[PDB]
Amino acid sequence: NSSVRHGLTSAQHEVWLAQQLDPRGAHYRTGSCLEIDGPLDHAVLSRALRLTVAGTETLCSRFLTDEEGRPYRAYCPPAPEGSAAVEDPDGVPYTPVLLRHIDLSGHEDPEGEAQRWMDRDRATPLPLDRPGLSSHALFTLGGGRHLYYLGVHHIVIDGTSMALFYERLAEVYRALRDGRAVPAAAFGDTDRMVAGEEAYRASARYERDRAYWTGLFTDRPEPVSLTGRGGGRALAPTVRSLGLPPERTEVLGRAAEATGAHWARVVIAGVAAFLHRTTGARDVVVSVPVTGRYGANARITPGMVSNRLPLRLAVRPGESFARVVETVSEAMSGLLAHSRFRGEDLDRELGGAGVSGPTVNVMPYIRPVDFGGPVGLMRSISSGPTTDLNIVLTGTPESGLRVDFEGNPQVYGGQDLTVLQERFVRFLAELAADPAATVDEVALLT
């Protein structure tokens, strides 16, 4: 039973291949956190974590290679409650579960100290053969404020699964504090999700998608950076984060209402317009993440199935910002209709450095996490490695946003990211304030 060999998802397989190239690197360490506005009980939250992890297969997994050098996933339950043992009676390693408690209340700069701690953690390798590929810390910041850090290996947890985890952790915590029965985990099955992907690869639809993507990028446009460079390996990013209050972000909501487009499309159009104005390029490429989750089971299965696809956009002279939004939606229609095809498979068939642009990741709405009084607001710490730039947004136009520019350190210094980020957010807001305006005429800061 413990010897059941689980197949990897497409996303996991690609992470595994990439990791092999730099076996002891930490470039696939990613993370997020919850900013929590009220006091929590660490002992109870620690028990909540043990229960949560036990019910989350991906967080109890390790990865090994079979006799032919092919990877597989192995499920390793945590130790029994109260046990100090680290391997089971048959020698199977137990998934460890540790919630660190780091009291920074009283330090000169609790928030800055927490960030430094999280950066140090993210730079720490997590060997794939050791089960429980995550790292958890509860910070006490003072004023009753906390920060819950979830660090993971990319291979076990994607953006969608971070939200799944936080909601489950809080649900268990509330139950324990209340003396209620812990609601049963409602997570789906990874094996079924993988079987779904295999079913896809076996269907005629696979070929239709292959033809669609390859045809769209025959000319094999060279990936370009905002900097002029110059791309190489995907590396852990330098992250610069900017908070924008509702007074600054509401305008995105108004532009969405006016154009009839979801606000994420407005952001994507904004990035396209910004690239156009920066480089003069008529033909711009941005890359867009999709969840890779198809069907009810997939939607509730913590894991790594995320996909990344190239969005090719023509920005023509005289076009209004509203018009660019329309171009984005037309391009997205095609992308979504062929979303099952792996971005990695497309690059592989095109050769070279593949096709890509800045990753534009507008995270889906997540309800504030309720710990039974205290509330947790999620923010990204690092979304993953990049050959160039990831642009990550969390929040909504109404509630305010966090904008993270995550740059490959061989391409950007932190100060470069700060400068580019500021110019972008101001330009985006200028565009959003009047979508009828001509893109080529909109004010762009030096």
166 and 291 fall within a common domain: no
C-alpha torsion 54→56→58→64, nearest 10: 20
Tell me phi and psi for residue 302, to 5 degrees. Answer: -55, 135
107 C-beta neighbours (distance < 10 Å), count = 13
Residues 193 and 295: their CA atoms lie apart, in Å, by 9
**Beta bridge mates, 136:** 99, 150
Residues 227 and 247: their CA atoms lie apart, in Å, by 30
355 and 227 fall within a common domain: yes
Tell me phi and psi for residue 134, to 5 degrees. Answer: -145, 170
Residues 207 and 191: their CA atoms lie apart, in Å, by 24
* CATH assignment at residue 246: 3.30.559.30
**What is the DSSP pairing of strand 307-314 with strand 369-370?**
unpaired
**Residue 291 vs residues 134, 143, 295, 367: alpha-carbon distances, Å:** 20, 37, 12, 18
Tokens of 178: 């209340």
Residues 376 and 374: their CA atoms lie apart, in Å, by 7
Examine the fold and report which residue of 219, 250, 272 is the final residue of a domain before the chain moves on: 219
Residues 360 and 270: their CA atoms lie apart, in Å, by 10
Residues 325 and 219: their CA atoms lie apart, in Å, by 24
Examine the fold and report which residue of 173, 193, 219 is the final residue of a domain before the chain moves on: 219
354 close to 376: Cβ distance less than 8 angstroms? no
Residues 19 and 26: their CA atoms lie apart, in Å, by 9
* CATH assignment at residue 16: 3.30.559.10
b/e code 359-370 from CB counts within 10 Å (16+ = b): bbbbbeebeebe
Residues 390 and 408: their CA atoms lie apart, in Å, by 9
262 and 390 fall within a common domain: yes
275 close to 282: Cβ distance less than 8 angstroms? no
Residues 193 and 301: their CA atoms lie apart, in Å, by 8
305 and 445 fall within a common domain: yes
275 and 143 fall within a common domain: no
Question: Has residue 2 been placed in a domain?
Answer: no
Residues 164 and 56: their CA atoms lie apart, in Å, by 10
15 C-beta neighbours (distance < 10 Å), count = 25
153 and 51 fall within a common domain: yes
398 close to 365: Cβ distance less than 8 angstroms? no
Q: How was this structure determined?
A: X-ray
283 and 232 fall within a common domain: yes
274 and 179 fall within a common domain: no
Tell me which residue range forms the domain holding 263.
221-446
How far is C-alpha 326 from the geometric centre of its chain's CA atoms?
26
Question: Has residue 254 been placed in a domain?
Answer: yes
Could you give the number of structural domains in the chain?
2
Question: Has residue 3 been placed in a domain?
Answer: no
Could you tell me which residues come within 8 angstroms of residue 228 by beta carbon, excluding any fewer than 6 positions away? none
Examine the fold and report which residue of 170, 203, 219 is the final residue of a domain before the chain moves on: 219
Three state DSSP letters for the chain: CCCCCECCCHHHHHHHHHHHHCCCCCCCEEEEEEEECCCCCHHHHHHHHHHHHHCCHHHHEEEEECCCCCEEEEECCECCCCCCCCECCCCCECECCCEEEEECECECCHHHHHHHHHHHHHCCCCCCCCCCCEEEEEEEEECCEEEEEEEEECCCCCHHHHHHHHHHHHHHHHHHHHCCCCCCCCCCCHHHHHHHHHHHHHCHHHHHHHHHHHHHCCCCCCCCCCCCCCCCCCECCEEEEEEECHHHHHHHHHHHHHHCCCHHHHHHHHHHHHHHHHHCCCEEEEEEEECCCCCHHHHCCCCCCCEEEEEEEECCCCCEHHHHHHHHHHHHHHHHHCCCCCHHHHHHHHCCCCCCCCEEEECCCCCCEECCCCEEEEEEEECCCECCEEEEEEEECCCEEEEEEEECCCCCCHHHHHHHHHHHHHHHHHHHHCCCCEHHHCCCCC
Question: Has residue 189 been placed in a domain?
Answer: yes
Question: Has residue 344 been placed in a domain?
Answer: yes
Interior angle at CA 191, CA 346 and CA 299, nearest 5: 70
377 and 285 fall within a common domain: yes
149 and 259 fall within a common domain: no
Resolution (A): 1.7
End-to-end CA distance of the chain: 62
186 and 330 fall within a common domain: no
143 and 248 fall within a common domain: no
